[PDB]
C-alpha cells in the first residue's frame, strides 16, 4: 500500500494517467487517485470482497463502496441519537435496581442496538414476513426491551429471563411497513 513498492515517487503526484473508468473517469492525477482510494477503503469501514468468483456480484459491491455512505438527513440523525439514549438508560436501570447483572452488560457495545434496528427496518421495506433472532447472554434484556418491544412489567416479575423466548411487532417510522420479530430459546452451551 506504499507508492515506493510500485516504483512511483512524490514527483508523479501532479502528472495525469489513464485509469480505465475508475471514479467514472478515463484520466485522473495520482493525487486524486490516492484521495479516492483512501476515502473508500481506509476510514471507518473495511471491506473484503475480491475473493468472490462471480463478476456481476463483485461489481455490485465495488460500485456501492466507491460511491460512499450517503449524507443522512437531520431527522435520520436525531432518530439514531434517540436509540443510543434508550440503550444507555436501560443499562443504568439494570446496574442500579438489580445485582449480579455485570456479567450481562452491553457497556462498550451500545451500537449493536442501532445496527439490529437498521437491518429489521430494511427488511420491512422489502416486504418480508418475519425476522428470527438467535444470540447469547450479553445484551439479551436490552434486545427484549428496545428491539422486540416487550414492556418493563413483563421482563421483571423452571428457568431465568436470559434463556426464554418472546414475540413482538416492528412498525416503520418513515414508511408503511410492518414485520414480526421472534427470539429463540437456548442453553448456556455456546
Amino acid at each position: 500500500l506504499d507508492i515506493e513498492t510500485h516504483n512511483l515517487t512524490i514527483w508523479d503526484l501532479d502528472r495525469t494517467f489513464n485509469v480505465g473508468g475508475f471514479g467514472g473517469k478515463e484520466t485522473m492525477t495520482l493525487r486524486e487517485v490516492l484521495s479516492r482510494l483512501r476515502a473508500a477503503y481506509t476510514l471507518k469501514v473495511g471491506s473484503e470482497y475480491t475473493h468472490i468468483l462471480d463478476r456481476d456480484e463483485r461489481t455490485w459491491l465495488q460500485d456501492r463502496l466507491e460511491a460512499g455512505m450517503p449524507k443522512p438527513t437531520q431527522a435520520e440523525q436525531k432518530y439514531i441519537l434517540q436509540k443510543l439514549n434508550a440503550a444507555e438508560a436501560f443499562e443504568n436501570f439494570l446496574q442500579t435496581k438489580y445485582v449480579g447483572q455485570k456479567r450481562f452488560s452491553l457497556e462498550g457495545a451500545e451500537a449493536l442496538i442501532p445496527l439490529m434496528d437498521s437491518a429489521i427496518d430494511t427488511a420491512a421495506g422489502q416486504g418480508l414476513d418475519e425476522v428470527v433472532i438467535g444470540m447469547p447472554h450479553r445484551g439479551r434484556l436490552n434486545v427484549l426491551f428496545n428491539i422486540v418491544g416487550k414492556p418493563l412489567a413483563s421482563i421483571f416479575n423452571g428457568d431465568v429471563k436470559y434463556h426464554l423466548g418472546s414475540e413482538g411487532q416492528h412498525l416503520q417510522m418513515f414508511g408503511d411497513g410492518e414485520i414480526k420479530v421472534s427470539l429463540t430459546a437456548n442453553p448456556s452451551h455456546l
Binding site: 489513464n18 480505465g20 468468483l53 462471480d54 463478476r55
Partner: protein
C-alpha cells in the same frame, strides 16, 4: 496421384463413401484409409465407382486458382488454391505487415453443369463455405471430436491501442491465470461434471 511401374505419373479419383452420416473424427479416419491403401496398392474396383462430387488442390505447387474440366456423371468440381500472401506483399517486413493487420487468403472455385445447376445456387454454396471457416459452432464441433480442452480462437477485427494500453492488458492476463487458472486444468481422470453443483464463471 500414383506413379506407374514405368515411372510416368497418372492421376485417378478414389471415393470416400456415405459422407453425410459422419462427424469429423469418422471423416478423418475414412480419408486416411484411402490414402494408406493407395500407397501400398490395395484399392479395388468398387473404390473407383459412384463419385457424386470432387475436390482438387492446385495450391500444393503454389497456383493461385484454376478453371478445371468436369467429367461425365457429376454436377460440380471444387478447386482449392494457394494459402500465401498476395505477390504485392511478398517482399515486405514481418514487422510492417504485423502493424497493419494483413492476413493470408485462400481462393476457392466451383465449375458446374449449367443444364441442372444455376449460377445463384453456385454463389450461395461458396458463401456458406466462407461463413463456416470463420464460425464459432463449426470450430466447437471439431475441438469436441478431437478432445481439445481449450476454447477455440474466435474471429474479430483488430482494435486500436487507445484508452488502457495493450501492455496493461497483457499484465492483467498474467494475473488472471496465476489466480483462477486452476478452474480449467486437466485434473479429473474421468470426463465427468456433477450435474447438481453450480459451474463457476471462467470468462477471465
Amino acid at each position: 496421384d500414383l506413379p506407374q511401374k514405368d515411372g510416368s505419373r497418372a492421376l485417378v479419383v478414389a471415393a470416400i463413401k456415405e459422407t453425410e452420416k459422419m462427424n469429423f473424427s469418422e471423416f478423418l479416419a475414412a480419408y486416411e484409409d484411402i490414402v494408406a491403401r493407395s500407397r501400398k496398392g490395395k484399392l479395388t474396383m468398387d473404390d473407383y465407382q459412384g463419385v457424386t462430387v470432387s475436390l482438387t488442390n492446385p495450391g500444393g505447387i503454389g497456383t493461385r486458382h484454376s478453371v478445371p474440366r468436369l467429367t461425365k456423371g457429376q454436377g460440380t468440381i471444387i478447386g482449392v488454391g494457394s494459402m500465401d500472401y498476395p505477390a504485392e506483399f511478398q517482399g515486405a517486413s514481418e514487422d510492417r505487415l504485423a502493424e497493419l493487420g494483413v492476413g493470408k487468403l485462400v481462393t476457392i472455385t466451383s465449375t458446374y453443369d449449367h443444364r441442372v445447376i444455376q449460377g445463384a445456387v453456385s454463389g450461395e454454396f461458396l458463401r456458406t463455405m466462407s461463413r463456416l471457416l470463420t464460425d464459432d459452432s463449426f470450430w466447437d464441433e471439431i475441438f469436441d471430436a478431437m478432445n481439445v480442452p481449450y476454447t477455440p480462437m474466435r474471429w474479430a477485427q483488430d482494435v486500436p491501442n487507445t484508452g488502457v494500453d495493450k501492455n496493461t492488458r497483457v499484465m492483467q492476463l498474467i494475473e488472471a491465470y496465476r489466480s483462477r487458472g486452476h478452474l480449467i486444468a486437466d485434473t479429473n481422470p474421468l470426463s465427468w461434471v456433477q450435474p447438481g453443483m453450480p459451474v463457476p464463471d471462467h470468462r477471465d
